[PDB]
Amino acid sequence: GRNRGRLLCMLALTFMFMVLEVVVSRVTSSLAMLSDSFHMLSDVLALVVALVAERFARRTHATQKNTFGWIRAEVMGALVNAIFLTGLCFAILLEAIERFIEPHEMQQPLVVLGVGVAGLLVNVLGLCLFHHGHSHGGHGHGHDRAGQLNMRGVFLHVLGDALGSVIVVVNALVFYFSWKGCSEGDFCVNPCFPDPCKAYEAGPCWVLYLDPTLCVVMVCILLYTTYPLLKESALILLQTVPKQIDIRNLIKELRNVEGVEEVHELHVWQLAGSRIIATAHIKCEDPTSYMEVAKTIKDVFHNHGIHATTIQPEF
Amino acid sequence: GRNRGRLLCMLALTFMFMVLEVVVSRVTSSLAMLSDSFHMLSDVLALVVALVAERFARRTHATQKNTFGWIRAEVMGALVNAIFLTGLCFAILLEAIERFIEPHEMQQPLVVLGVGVAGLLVNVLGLCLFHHGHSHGGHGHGHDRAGQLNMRGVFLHVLGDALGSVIVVVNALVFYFSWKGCSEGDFCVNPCFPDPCKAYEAGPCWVLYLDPTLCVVMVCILLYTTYPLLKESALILLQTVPKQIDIRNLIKELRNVEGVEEVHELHVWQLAGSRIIATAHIKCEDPTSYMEVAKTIKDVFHNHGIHATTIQPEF
Ligand SMILES: [Zn+2]
Ligand SMILES: [Zn+2]
Ligand SMILES: [Zn+2]
Ligand SMILES: [Zn+2]
């Protein structure tokens, strides 16, 4: 409820800021603003993926197209958001390099500054806002993490953009305060800026390379903060034993338990969130005591937290 | 062996064509070629993430950080390649739109045509070249798909680029054969092309919008051919029952087996490739006949192909 509401609100606000950019470009007769319209198309794509994902994670029930259900869909949503952000980070880095090798000068600094401040406000609002395993429930004795991962994915995109907004605002301010370049055409020369199109002193060209370098630094930050989630997400999709559980201790402890000849094929794997699933085979001697033995076996897995289990007797 | 060899060969050839583009740009004093040097960073990135996938998928061996192995790592490699291609497709579409709204004219058509023909040859070479679940093996009676998915992922990128090379070559040819635009400056006017920088008849402007539209069409093709894999890959990561297996028939057939009145918690899920894993609970009356009953139970799962199983008795 709350999560879907937050995502829908941000998607709606994102469309509103898209319309604001388009109309501002229309009044100003500029096209790079329209280019900013498309970054907005990309934030809208992250938000829509995070959401298919919330509806779907909710169908936590035993369908027959998935005997397990869909919570893993939410983890995958987090994963794909992370991968999308990493791809956008690489494309941003390659644009930063392309602007380092080819400096780019912009026009109408005031409207750029205004749209950048508005985007900074929107992104700060988003960052403040976004701050059948038979497991989550039931003691589990028998005869929520995914939400955090999905929101951290959306939070990283919003942070990414926010850093983009900070870079645009700072660059526009530095241009307006410290760049005195010439465009009138009378006593006009651009020594630093190459490519002064076709055939006083211009502004300090060092400032223009202020834009690339910070962007590069920016992506590093994002990549750093992106790395744990895509690690965590790709391990929720690798059937790796969760870090809290160690298998060597489990094997020796199980065998310690009475009546148990062995264990073989112990697979412990983590479902989406805290729904760790473990299946085992346990050799015994007397099948009748097997049941009490199996309850002891359930007690072990249990101490270790694995409260969903299937342990074949293999007499 | 063969797969790692193909991937390493294409990565090496990709670096060679990167160096060729950089040196050609150096001789020609052009920078958009350097832009082509960067798409190359992306083809190289797919090729590396398709590989770490190959390196890991072979460690199919009961580790204690992952009790299943890493074949799922290969499926995830396929998945991430697909997602990367889809992201590049969206960015390409948004660049195509940005060039539709702002037409772009290029210089030095001959070197662009040569690099495009070389890239077309490289991409055609790549397309012709790239054309413990205890399941793959063992009868499995007891007391390779992932490679296709990973290569189809790499094949789709290579196809994507190949279509990019075809578009660049065709556009360069059409410019050289049907575009007679003016740049000398004497009896010179660009009516269609707006933004003729700062202050005869130019070439037909309809051709210049030839570049955007085809690109858009191109991405559609890619998206179409990309959709099944990312569906197939994201279901290998959703624990959904494989399409060949239906659960309703399985439940009734297991119930029809003599000595069984119950099944509960039937989970059937597909490991990476054809390593379908199914765990079940089966209630019985006489534990001694349970063993022969369990062999019958193994026969059922088996017919259905589920060749790894754990089936707790719950007497
Ligand atoms: Zn963004
Ligand atoms: Zn317990
Ligand atoms: Zn490519
Ligand atoms: Zn069989």
UniProtKB/Swiss-Prot annotation, chains A, B:
UniProt-annotated binding residues for Zn(2+): 39, 43, 157, 161
Record GO cellular component, one term: plasma membrane
Keywords: Antiport, Cell membrane, Cytoplasm, Cytoplasmic vesicle, Endoplasmic reticulum, Glycoprotein, Golgi apparatus, Ion transport, Membrane, Metal-binding, Nucleus, Phosphoprotein, Repeat, Transmembrane, Transmembrane helix, Transport, Zinc, Zinc transport
Entry's induction text: Up-regulated by zinc (at protein level). Up-regulated in macrophages by LPS (at protein level).
Membrane topology, Cytoplasmic segments: 1-6, 53-74
Membrane topology: Multi-pass membrane protein
Annotated stretches, region: 6 X 2 AA approximate repeats of H-G: 132-143
Key word Cell membrane present: yes
Intracellular or extracellular location(s): Cell membrane; Basolateral cell membrane; Cytoplasmic vesicle membrane; Cytoplasm
Catalyses which reaction(s): Zn(2+)(in) + 2 H(+)(out) = Zn(2+)(out) + 2 H(+)(in)
Any Gene Ontology biological process: intracellular zinc ion homeostasis
PTM comment text: N-glycosylation promotes endocytosis and degradation through the proteasomal or lysosomal pathways.
Extracellular side: 28-31, 96-109, 176-202
Sample GO molecular function, one term: zinc ion transmembrane transporter activity
Membrane-spanning intervals of the chain: 7-27, 32-52, 75-95, 110-130, 155-175, 203-223
Protein family membership: Belongs to the cation diffusion facilitator (CDF) transporter (TC 2.A.4) family. SLC30A subfamily.
Function according to Swiss-Prot or TrEMBL: Zinc ion:proton antiporter that could function at the plasma membrane mediating zinc efflux from cells against its electrochemical gradient protecting them from intracellular zinc accumulation and toxicity. Alternatively, could prevent the transport to the plasma membrane of CACNB2, the L-type calcium channels regulatory subunit, through a yet to be defined mechanism. By modulating the expression of these channels at the plasma membrane, could prevent calcium and zinc influx into cells. By the same mechanism, could also prevent L-type calcium channels-mediated heavy metal influx into cells.
Subunit-level organization: Homodimer. Interacts with TMEM163. Interacts and forms a complex with TMC6 and TMC8; the interaction regulates zinc transport into the ER. (Microbial infection) Interacts with human papillomavirus 16/HPV16 protein E5; the interaction alleviates SLC30A1-mediated transcription factors inhibition.
Protein name, as recorded: Proton-coupled zinc antiporter SLC30A1
Lineage: Eukaryota, Metazoa, Chordata, Craniata, Vertebrata
Gene that encodes the chain: SLC30A1
Interval of the full protein contained in this chain: 5 to 421 of 507
